[PDB]
Ligand binder design. Structure first.
Ligand SMILES: C[C@]12CCC(=O)C=C1CC[C@@H]1[C@@H]2[C@@H](O)C[C@@]2(C)[C@H]1CC[C@]2(O)C(=O)CO
Length: 342
């Protein structure tokens, strides 16, 4: 069970953060990777107790070494569901001005996490931001092309994750066709809609009015597509917890379905300074300003590697919730509110 030792903490943290973010802006697409955010905060706590406490740990019960060792081990366990998941995750620190990180900190970070520190010598912010942008692109297989544009900091942390998976039940690109997606009450937009028929894990819940489709990736990855009943998005969002997802996971059963899911890439940024407030940058530097951002990017596509029951049609053609998890570590790989895939 040790491979799952951080799940309860990490996943409580993930659902609370997600709910907070959806509340702050309910009308936007939200995409984050909680496990990636947990890693980034844990990593910065190497050089800074209020960071770790904010992640959900009580340090009277778990020592510092225990946490960093658990996170190290988790990072190794995560890079293994990659049989059917392209998952470029990492942390880059960019140091502007004449600033150097402590040798102690830089070493601890390389060791327990896989982070990188780069000196940006351009005073001009346009160049600086571009170099920072070229970095993260290269590290994400050409996929995250911009992070900044935007207020220049002296010390910049980028936590990034590109994710893209191969389905156990892939869609046929031939079947993908333009359909209406209903964004809100007045506006429809056209999106490429993927379509397949088959026996697919499905649940129609009543306490929280939604329908769920569970789509497995090849490997240990899995996706919950959650379609709230009409008018019920706020309710379902409030339902989200480790308690609730445990229930759902146990009630999913194969059912013959006609399944319509949009093909899209989504990306989003999250200011880590609202979970990691009042860091002392001087604790990290050998001896001004601070930008710490998490950028997540999900490519959702057809995902291919190479009965006398009437099927039910379920279309994700209006806003929905997308939760990606690792079945092995119980990690939250991504949580999303998909409001508009066009
Ligand atoms: C709440 C739960 C169990 C207790 C825990 O500390 C953390 C979690 C979060 C992730 C959950 C997990 C289990 O319920 C099994 C789940 C649902 C997993 C995500 C995907 C899962 O592995 C399955 O889909 C199993 O079919």
């Amino acid at each position: 069970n040790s491979h799952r030792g951080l799940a309860p903490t990490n996943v409580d943290f993930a659902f609370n953060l997600y709910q907070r973010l959806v509340a702050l802006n309910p009308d936007k697409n939200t995409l984050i990777s909680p496990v990636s955010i947990s890693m980034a905060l844990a990593m910065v706590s190497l050089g800074s107790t209020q960071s770790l406490q904010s992640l959900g740990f009580n340090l009277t019960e778990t020592s510092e070494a225990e946490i960093h060792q658990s996170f190290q081990y988790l990072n190794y366990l995560l890079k293994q569901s990659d049989t059917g998941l392209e998952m470029n995750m990492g942390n880059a620190m960019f140091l502007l001005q004449k600033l150097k990180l402590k040798d102690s900190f830089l070493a601890d970070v390389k060791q327990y996490y896989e982070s990188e520190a780069l000196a940006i010598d351009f005073e001009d912010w346009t160049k600086a931001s571009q170099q920072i942008n070229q970095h993260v692109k290269d590290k994400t297989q050409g996929k995250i092309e911009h992070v900044f544009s935007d207020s220049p900091a002296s010390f910049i942390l980028v936590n990034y994750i590109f994710l893209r998976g191969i389905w156990e039940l892939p869609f046929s690109p031939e079947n993908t066709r333009e359909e209406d997606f209903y964004v809100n009450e007045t506006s429809t937009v056209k999106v490429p809609m993927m379509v397949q028929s088959g026996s697919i894990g499905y649940f129609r819940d009543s306490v929280f009015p939604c329908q769920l489709i569970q789509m497995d990736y090849v490997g240990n990855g899995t996706a919950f597509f959650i379609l709230p009943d009409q008018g019920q998005m706020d309710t379902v969002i409030a339902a989200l917890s480790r308690d609730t997802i445990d229930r759902w996971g146990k009630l999913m059963t194969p059912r013959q379905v006609n399944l319509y899911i949009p093909k899209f890439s989504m990306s989003d940024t999250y200011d880590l300074k609202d979970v990691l407030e009042d860091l002392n940058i001087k604790d990290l530097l050998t001896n001004l300003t601070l930008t710490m951002v998490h950028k997540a990017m999900l490519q959702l596509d057809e995902g291919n590697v190479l009965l006398r029951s009437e099927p039910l049609d379920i279309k994700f053609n209006k806003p929905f919730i997308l939760l990606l998890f690792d079945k092995f570590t119980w990690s939250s790989l991504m949580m999303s509110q998909v409001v508009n895939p066009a």
